[PDB]
């Protein structure tokens with residue numbers, strides 16, 4: 560039933576509003592992706608608020624969690640869309656904005672694009688189910704926390720365990736087989752941290768020199784990155800890993 564709720568609140572597809580009549584310069588591609596991000600952010604917040612248990616957390620905890628994990632959430636969903644739509648061959652940012660080889664090249668971030676595509680390829684290798692995907696996604700929202708703790712730790716800890724339990728539910732044949740599956744899926748979750756570190760680095764860099772580099776960011780994103788950046792730079796956040 561918790562999973563049925565996840566399927567119900569899963570956001571609808573978000574379009575980039577991209578104009579293919581324009582040249583695909585790095586400036587336009589990145590500004591276009593950031594505009595898409597702003598629209599996705601709206602969907603993400605509405606989603607977080609509908610998650611059983613999220614509301615129970617303090618308002619500052621809800622805000623902190625979203626700002627620390629939005630990049631992981633969007634990159635993870637990107638991996639899923641790319642998996643279901645292109646079997647991991649292209650990056651399906653949006654129905655109207657699919658990144659092929661040419662776009663990855665002109666984006667100036669080919670390496671990050673391949674890092675994101677690798678997530679999609681892991682979905683392929685593991686044949687991740689929609690249910691596993693949904694549970695894993697919630698876990699990402701709950702896997703980057705303040706080193707000094709949350710105001711609703713008890714509630715947070717409770718919520719996290721419930722969703723981890725839900726994941727094992729989605730996973731469940733043989734017990735050892737289920738254990739192996741949990742091992743593999745959580746390895747994928749842990750792998751998001753290093754990827755996101757690279758995504759955020761380029762995000763903060765272009766954000767800081769937005770005007771100079773002509774890379775536009777919507778206000779929906781500017782507000783969040785403005786506050787998040789110093790917190791991350793100061794090293795206030797830590798990951799909640801599943802493996803050594």
Ligand SMILES: C[C@]12C=CC(=O)C=C1CC[C@@H]1[C@@H]2C(=O)C[C@@]2(C)[C@H]1CC[C@]2(O)/C(O)=C/O
Nearest residue numbers: 589592593596633634637652758761762765
């Ligand atoms: C959020 C986003 C776009 C929506 C989406 O489905 C997935 C992502 C993940 C990668 C993000 C990307 C954009 O936001 C543009 C970013 C943020 C890129 C990481 C580097 C980036 O290309 C950047 O820094 C351009 O300025």
